[PDB]
């Protein structure tokens, strides 16, 4: 069908990600509205409401029933190129798409690099504290 590492790109798959999810009809941040904004529901015990943009990888929790998924997304990751995509997926050119997929994988990389940095830095304090205690 569609390459199973490219479905986050189409709304239906994004909706289909919403398994539990509170907030439905009556609320502004429905599945449909989350998915139109780029969100994927990636739930856990510690937080069963966490949403992630498939494109920029921003993770946002603490959803309020009247949060606008789009505004919520602009006012937390102004960078996201997905916000700029104003064409349907089928209406995308292979270039446009391949361009978008380039920036995506990059984001995936920058996100993983920002993470490695922090873990490193945290390790560096514990080592430094320890050798300090020895002082």
């Amino acid at each position: 069908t569609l390459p199973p590492a490219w479905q986050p790109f189409l709304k239906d798959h994004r909706i289909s990600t919403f398994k539990n999810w509170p907030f439905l009809e009556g609320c502004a941040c429905t599945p449909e509205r989350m998915a139109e904004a780029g969100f994927i529901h990636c739930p856990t015990e510690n937080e069963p409401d966490l949403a992630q943009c498939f494109f920029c990888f921003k993770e946002l929790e603490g959803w309020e029933p009247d949060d606008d998924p789009i505004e919520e997304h602009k006012k937390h990751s102004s960078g996201c190129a997905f916000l700029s995509v104003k064409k349907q997926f089928e209406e995308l050119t292979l270039g446009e798409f391949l361009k978008l997929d380039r920036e995506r994988a990059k984001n995936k990389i920058a996100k993983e690099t920002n993470n490695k940095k922090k873990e490193f830095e945290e390790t560096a304090k514990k080592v430094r504290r320890a050798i300090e205690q020895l002082a």
């Binding site: 966490l50 993770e59 946002l60 929790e61 603490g62 959803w63 309020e64 919520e72 937390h76």
Partner: peptide
């Protein structure tokens, strides 16, 4: 919504 809040940043993790």
């Amino acid at each position: 919504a809040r940043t993790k």
